[PDB]
Design an enzyme around this catalytic site. Sequence first.
Site, PDB file in Angstrom:
ATOM      1  N   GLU A  31       0.938  -1.243  -0.099  1.00  0.00           N
ATOM      2  CA  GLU A  31      -0.023  -0.021   0.093  1.00  0.00           C
ATOM      3  C   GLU A  31       0.863   1.271  -0.077  1.00  0.00           C
ATOM      4  OE1 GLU A  31      -2.493   2.724   0.048  1.00  0.00           O
ATOM      5  OE2 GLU A  31      -3.421   1.071  -0.182  1.00  0.00           O
ATOM      6  N   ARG A 112     -17.320   3.909   3.328  1.00  0.00           N
ATOM      7  CA  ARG A 112     -15.979   3.222   2.734  1.00  0.00           C
ATOM      8  C   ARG A 112     -15.016   3.152   3.851  1.00  0.00           C
ATOM      9  NH1 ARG A 112     -10.893   3.607   0.904  1.00  0.00           N
ATOM     10  NH2 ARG A 112     -10.168   2.566  -0.862  1.00  0.00           N
ATOM     11  N   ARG A 194     -23.720  15.282  -3.009  1.00  0.00           N
ATOM     12  CA  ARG A 194     -24.195  14.351  -2.005  1.00  0.00           C
ATOM     13  C   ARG A 194     -24.317  15.085  -0.363  1.00  0.00           C
ATOM     14  NH1 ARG A 194     -19.078  10.957  -3.519  1.00  0.00           N
ATOM     15  NH2 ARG A 194     -18.686  13.250  -3.135  1.00  0.00           N
ATOM     16  N   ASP A 316     -11.221  -1.137  -9.654  1.00  0.00           N
ATOM     17  CA  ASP A 316     -11.322   0.144 -10.469  1.00  0.00           C
ATOM     18  C   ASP A 316     -10.199  -0.046 -11.497  1.00  0.00           C
ATOM     19  OD1 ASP A 316     -13.693   0.799  -9.248  1.00  0.00           O
ATOM     20  OD2 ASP A 316     -12.556   2.709  -8.266  1.00  0.00           O
ATOM     21  N   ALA A 329     -17.252  -0.952  -6.977  1.00  0.00           N
ATOM     22  CA  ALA A 329     -16.536  -1.529  -5.619  1.00  0.00           C
ATOM     23  C   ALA A 329     -16.999  -3.075  -5.623  1.00  0.00           C
ATOM     24  CB  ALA A 329     -16.550  -0.885  -4.388  1.00  0.00           C
TER      25      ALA A 329
HETATM   26  C1  LIG Z   1     -13.537  11.491  -3.873  1.00  0.00           C
HETATM   27  C2  LIG Z   1     -14.270  10.164  -4.159  1.00  0.00           C
HETATM   28  C3  LIG Z   1     -15.406   9.911  -4.205  1.00  0.00           C
HETATM   29  C4  LIG Z   1     -15.736   8.469  -4.441  1.00  0.00           C
HETATM   30  N1  LIG Z   1     -17.341   8.454  -4.249  1.00  0.00           N
HETATM   31  C5  LIG Z   1     -18.004   7.225  -4.482  1.00  0.00           C
HETATM   32  C6  LIG Z   1     -19.161   6.996  -4.511  1.00  0.00           C
HETATM   33  O1  LIG Z   1     -19.941   8.140  -4.226  1.00  0.00           O
HETATM   34  N2  LIG Z   1     -19.872   5.890  -4.910  1.00  0.00           N
HETATM   35  C7  LIG Z   1     -18.866   4.866  -5.316  1.00  0.00           C
HETATM   36  O2  LIG Z   1     -19.470   3.527  -5.444  1.00  0.00           O
HETATM   37  N3  LIG Z   1     -17.448   5.040  -5.296  1.00  0.00           N
HETATM   38  C8  LIG Z   1     -17.125   6.051  -4.896  1.00  0.00           C
HETATM   39  N4  LIG Z   1     -15.863   6.192  -5.176  1.00  0.00           N
HETATM   40  C9  LIG Z   1     -14.944   5.192  -5.352  1.00  0.00           C
HETATM   41  C10 LIG Z   1     -14.686   4.152  -4.421  1.00  0.00           C
HETATM   42  O3  LIG Z   1     -13.870   4.487  -3.207  1.00  0.00           O
HETATM   43  C11 LIG Z   1     -14.013   2.994  -5.158  1.00  0.00           C
HETATM   44  O4  LIG Z   1     -14.666   2.242  -6.403  1.00  0.00           O
HETATM   45  C12 LIG Z   1     -13.723   1.630  -4.324  1.00  0.00           C
HETATM   46  O5  LIG Z   1     -12.944   1.874  -3.182  1.00  0.00           O
HETATM   47  C13 LIG Z   1     -13.149   0.378  -4.893  1.00  0.00           C
HETATM   48  O6  LIG Z   1     -12.039   0.810  -5.345  1.00  0.00           O
HETATM   49  P1  LIG Z   1     -10.574  -0.199  -5.484  1.00  0.00           P
HETATM   50  O7  LIG Z   1     -10.709  -0.916  -4.283  1.00  0.00           O
HETATM   51  O8  LIG Z   1     -10.513  -0.862  -6.991  1.00  0.00           O
HETATM   52  O9  LIG Z   1      -9.634   0.925  -5.598  1.00  0.00           O
HETATM   53  P2  LIG Z   1      -9.192   2.036  -4.357  1.00  0.00           P
HETATM   54  O10 LIG Z   1     -10.419   2.285  -3.564  1.00  0.00           O
HETATM   55  O11 LIG Z   1      -8.800   3.239  -5.386  1.00  0.00           O
HETATM   56  O12 LIG Z   1      -7.926   1.587  -3.727  1.00  0.00           O
HETATM   57  C14 LIG Z   1      -6.898   1.341  -4.334  1.00  0.00           C
HETATM   58  C15 LIG Z   1      -5.615   1.333  -3.337  1.00  0.00           C
HETATM   59  O13 LIG Z   1      -4.372   1.247  -4.038  1.00  0.00           O
HETATM   60  C16 LIG Z   1      -3.611   2.336  -3.111  1.00  0.00           C
HETATM   61  N5  LIG Z   1      -2.434   2.579  -4.462  1.00  0.00           N
HETATM   62  C17 LIG Z   1      -2.849   3.355  -5.651  1.00  0.00           C
HETATM   63  N6  LIG Z   1      -1.765   3.397  -6.544  1.00  0.00           N
HETATM   64  C18 LIG Z   1      -0.764   2.732  -5.633  1.00  0.00           C
HETATM   65  C19 LIG Z   1       0.613   2.121  -6.173  1.00  0.00           C
HETATM   66  N7  LIG Z   1       1.337   2.453  -7.120  1.00  0.00           N
HETATM   67  N8  LIG Z   1       1.441   1.284  -5.119  1.00  0.00           N
HETATM   68  C20 LIG Z   1       0.619   1.009  -3.927  1.00  0.00           C
HETATM   69  N9  LIG Z   1      -0.499   1.331  -3.602  1.00  0.00           N
HETATM   70  C21 LIG Z   1      -1.364   1.907  -4.554  1.00  0.00           C
HETATM   71  C22 LIG Z   1      -4.475   3.595  -2.929  1.00  0.00           C
HETATM   72  O14 LIG Z   1      -3.615   4.286  -2.239  1.00  0.00           O
HETATM   73  C23 LIG Z   1      -5.611   2.588  -2.400  1.00  0.00           C
HETATM   74  O15 LIG Z   1      -5.473   2.365  -1.087  1.00  0.00           O
HETATM   75  C24 LIG Z   1     -15.118   7.436  -4.706  1.00  0.00           C
HETATM   76  C25 LIG Z   1     -13.701   7.851  -4.786  1.00  0.00           C
HETATM   77  C26 LIG Z   1     -12.954   9.033  -4.512  1.00  0.00           C
HETATM   78  C27 LIG Z   1     -11.793   9.193  -4.593  1.00  0.00           C
END
Ligand SMILES: Cc1cc2nc3c(=O)[nH]c(=O)nc-3n(C[C@H](O)[C@H](O)[C@H](O)COP(=O)(O)OP(=O)(O)OC[C@H]3O[C@@H](n4cnc5c(N)ncnc54)[C@H](O)[C@@H]3O)c2cc1C
Length: 431
Positions: A31, A112, A194, A316, A329
């Site tokens: 992370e 979240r 929101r 994502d 998600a």
């Molecule tokens: C401002 C904002 C508002 C949002 N609002 C909504 C909403 O209303 N509804 C909704 O459904 N979704 C929303 N989302 C999106 C939601 O948070 C994600 O869809 C959900 O967390 C699933 O994403 P994920 O687990 O695939 O990746 P993410 O949640 O993006 O997690 C990625 C992780 O990888 C880490 N990371 C990134 N690059 C690197 C790297 N090079 N090396 C190591 N670690 C790395 C990040 O720090 C993070 O911990 C929002 C996101 C943001 C930023």
Amino acid sequence: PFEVAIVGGGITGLALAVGLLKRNVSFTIYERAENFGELGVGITFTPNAQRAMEALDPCVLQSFTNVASAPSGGTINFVDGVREQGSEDPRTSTAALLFQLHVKGGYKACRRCDFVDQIVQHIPKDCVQYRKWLDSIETDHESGRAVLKFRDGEIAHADVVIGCDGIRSQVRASMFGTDELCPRAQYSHQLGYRGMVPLAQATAVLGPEKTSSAVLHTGPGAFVLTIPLAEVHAMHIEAFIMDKEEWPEVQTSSDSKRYVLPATRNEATKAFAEFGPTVRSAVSMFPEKLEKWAVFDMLEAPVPTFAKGRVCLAGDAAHASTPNQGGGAGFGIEDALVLAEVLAVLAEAPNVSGIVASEALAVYSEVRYERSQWLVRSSRRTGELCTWKDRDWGLAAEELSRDIISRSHQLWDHDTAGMVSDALAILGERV
Ligand SMILES: Cc1cc2nc3c(=O)[nH]c(=O)nc-3n(C[C@H](O)[C@H](O)[C@H](O)COP(=O)(O)OP(=O)(O)OC[C@H]3O[C@@H](n4cnc5c(N)ncnc54)[C@H](O)[C@@H]3O)c2cc1C
């Protein structure tokens, strides 16, 4: 023995991690941040995502249910937010109902940060390496294993690398590049506003008829969701405004800074001025100052596949979506389930070749790729339907209902069990 590197401790990565832990598959989460932060955005998980959570492990679903709120009634009423009849006081008006969307197997919403905090309790602290910002991936000359290289100058080794690193995935860049033509998320032309108010306030203002279930208020260029969450005594109000503009580009590591801008309630007031009293009243319940979230997706520039050699993408990183058919998600959790199951088969073997590792990831991609691409495209279209982009759907309720009920069925009523068994059947034939 077989080591999985999970890059990113988001919802996708953490869900996968618990899945692997419960199947005795060796992994490490890398992370980039010092901790998982405190982003409190509401995410709605659909029935498919909940089934996937349970199949990963009962504690994943438990982690979610521990913190999630059920809406008061479980059907989503689609209304025509302009042609509300009967009065200018929402308490005395009649909603212009188009159709009712019944969810099979429940939807719930959570913050979240709350869900992350829950899941993290099931992962040993030593399995997470913080301040590990993945920058590139190479192949070990001697072993042929993957070599992760971080911004701190250190390396790590793994048999497979799972990019769970979000909408601006560095793992994706490693696979396909980050030039102007490369796969990436781009603005979906949808801006989210929101807010949360006491359910008693919403009831006082709108009447209990209009706060008794989730309502999606459709109309020209914009829509509102009012979602009563009786167990925290809140009303969640979510407004999405369609924005034919491009989103101002900012160069920043922070997704909050990349995708969020200050706003005022007036922007919403103006957007919904031609709507009826209920929507105008709901929008009026926002704070005067708020943020707007620019929704990005991978519709225009998708990845061609989710796997390449020992490296793959989930969540994502693979298929950032609009949230119009539930939070992306949730489909990240589906991705994690298929990976957990396939990787467990590999972990059971004494030695796993590069060839076999690559074939396994290819199976994961074949199982998830087109269904994922369809999520991105269908969720985009649902937003266009709800904002009357090409038709006044207020005058075409039955046609609208058939379209939305069908797309929801395809996304939410998927055979989660069958998905996993299919993956493993294919894997068994191919390795
Ligand atoms: C401002 C904002 C508002 C949002 N609002 C909504 C909403 O209303 N509804 C909704 O459904 N979704 C929303 N989302 C999106 C939601 O948070 C994600 O869809 C959900 O967390 C699933 O994403 P994920 O687990 O695939 O990746 P993410 O949640 O993006 O997690 C990625 C992780 O990888 C880490 N990371 C990134 N690059 C690197 C790297 N090079 N090396 C190591 N670690 C790395 C990040 O720090 C993070 O911990 C929002 C996101 C943001 C930023």
